[PDB]
Amino acid sequence: KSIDEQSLHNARRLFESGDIDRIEVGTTAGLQQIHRYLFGGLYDFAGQIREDNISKGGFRFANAMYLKEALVKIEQMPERTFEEIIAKYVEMNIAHPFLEGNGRSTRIWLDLVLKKNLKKVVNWQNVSKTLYLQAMERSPVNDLELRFLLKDNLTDDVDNREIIFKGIEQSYYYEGYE
């Protein structure tokens, strides 16, 4: 819980400082920069591609033995349309490259890709925890729930402090932290 508190402060600092603007967009290295920023000094494995296997619910995330190879192909996916970007996010979630903190880091990664390509980001504060988690769990089979949920909650006000900071708080709530 104290880990989350410091991590939340790191997420706030990432945007306050403008360091968010220095992150490589839509790449594996980019995701690793985010993870390192959020969790450096908190998880030993911050920024590091996992070597163990993990699952959640009935889903086993990409096998560690071919995770690196998968990430190579995932980062090459196109980013021109909303549908392409969500598909790319869905595959990066399936990769789930870190032992922990995949959700918070990859959502920031998603916003960067959406901002670069569509000049929008997700207004996370209005995205229900229940609906978001259900949609993610379904996304490997069908991303319809996710597309429906996120498309309704896009905003072109991408630097607004309230959207940014209330979104960081909801993002952290998705994995347990109030």
Swiss-Prot record:
Domain of life according to the entry: Bacteria
Molecular-function GO terms, alphabetical: AMPylase activity; ATP binding; protein homodimerization activity
InterPro entries named among the record's database cross-references: Fido, Fido-like_dom_sf
GO biological process: protein adenylylation; regulation of cell division
Catalytic activity, reaction form: L-tyrosyl-[protein] + ATP = O-(5'-adenylyl)-L-tyrosyl-[protein] + diphosphate; L-threonyl-[protein] + ATP = 3-O-(5'-adenylyl)-L-threonyl-[protein] + diphosphate
Activity control summary: Adenylyltransferase activity is inhibited by the inhibitory helix present at the C-terminus: Glu-175 binds ATP and competes with ATP-binding at Arg-107, thereby preventing adenylyltransferase activity. Activation dissociates ATP-binding from Glu-175, allowing ordered binding of the entire ATP moiety with the alpha-phosphate in an orientation that is productive for accepting an incoming target hydroxyl side chain.
Coiled coil start-end: none
Consequence the record notes for mutating residue 175 to A: Promotes adenylyltransferase activity
Pfam families, alphabetized: Fic (PF02661)
PANTHER family attached to this UniProt entry: PROTEIN ADENYLYLTRANSFERASE FIC-RELATED
Protein name: Protein adenylyltransferase NmFic
The species this protein was found in: Neisseria meningitidis serogroup B (strain ATCC BAA-335 / MC58)
